[PDB]
Amino acid sequence: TLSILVAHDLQRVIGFENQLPWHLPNDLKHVKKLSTGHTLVMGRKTFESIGKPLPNRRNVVLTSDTSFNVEGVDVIHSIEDIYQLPGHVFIFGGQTLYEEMIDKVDDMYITVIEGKFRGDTFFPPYTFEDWEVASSVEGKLDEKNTIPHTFLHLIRK
Ligand SMILES: NC(=O)C1=CN([C@@H]2O[C@H](COP(=O)(O)OP(=O)(O)OC[C@H]3O[C@@H](n4cnc5c(N)ncnc54)[C@H](OP(=O)(O)O)[C@@H]3O)[C@@H](O)[C@H]2O)C=CC1
Ligand SMILES: CCc1nc(N)nc(N)c1C#CCc1cc(OC)ccc1OC
Numbered sequence: 312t313l314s315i316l317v318a319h320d321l322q323r324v325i326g327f328e329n330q331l332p333w334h335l336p337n338d339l340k341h342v343k344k345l346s347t348g349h350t351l352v353m354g355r356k357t358f359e360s361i362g363k364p365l366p367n368r369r370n371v372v373l374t375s376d377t378s379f380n381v382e383g384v385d386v387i388h389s390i391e392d393i394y395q396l397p398g399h400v401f402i403f404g405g406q407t408l409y410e411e412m413i414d415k416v417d418d419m420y421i422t423v424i425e426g427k428f429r430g431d432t433f434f435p436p437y438t439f440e441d442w443e444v445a446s447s448v449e450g451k452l453d454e455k456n457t458i459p460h461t462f463l464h465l466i467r468k
Contacts (some may be wrong), residue, residue, distance in 0.1 A: 312417055315402045316351075316414065321337060321426060321434075325433060326430060327429055330360065332428035332429065333426070333458055338422045347367060350369040350400045351401050352372075352393055352396070353371070353403040354407055356373070358370075358381075369396075371396065372384075372386055374390075390412075393412075401420070406435075413435050418466045420465075443467075444464075444465060447462070448461065449461050450462060
């Protein structure tokens with residue numbers, strides 16, 4: 312399976328100044344559950360802003376940098392290399408990779424953050440006429456998760 316995994320707000324903001332614009336522990340749990348034991352593919356910028364590989368899954372970084380080397384990270388140099396990766400692969404960001412991959416993925420795991428944040432990074436526009444709603448689950452609000460959010464699993468029609 313080739314999937315997108317993304318959290319975006321009401322205007323499809325995914326980032327601001329190399330950071331996530333929101334604090335949502337419930338969404339990190341969602342990511343952890345979905346991708347533990349599987350593969351995350353991300354662009355160089357997303358990885359650098361994270362800082363280190365995410366534990367207990369394969370971390371794959373796409374870059375043109377032939378010098379790129381991090382312990383616990385596998386490197387690829389073209390989109391085409393993605394399709395040779397075995398298992399369930401999640402496209403993890405950022406904007407450039409989503410733009411390159413949105414028309415290629417089987418399905419998308421989207422966390423819709425129900426707010427309007429300042430952003431400099433965006434998920435590409437998409438229509439629900441191309442995508443079936445496999446599931447839609449409202450995230451739970453509590454002390455540590457204070458922004459409304461909905462987990463969508465969308466499958467290409
Ligand atoms: N809310 C969310 O779900 C997530 C948020 N984000 C946010 O997005 C931001 C990063 O997005 P963005 O700025 O677009 O950067 P990206 O994460 O998409 O990385 C861009 C870099 O990836 C490499 N790359 C991309 N495509 C190719 C290719 N075809 N061949 C070789 N290398 C390639 C290049 O690296 P190089 O220049 O080294 O060659 C490029 O400069 C971050 O600020 C982050 O916070 C990201 C993912 C998820
Ligand atoms: C955890 C944020 C997130 N959620 C979903 N649902 N999909 C994603 N692709 C992402 C992401 C991301 C990049 C990122 C992750 C991170 O986890 C510790 C920390 C920082 C990040 O970029 C600043």
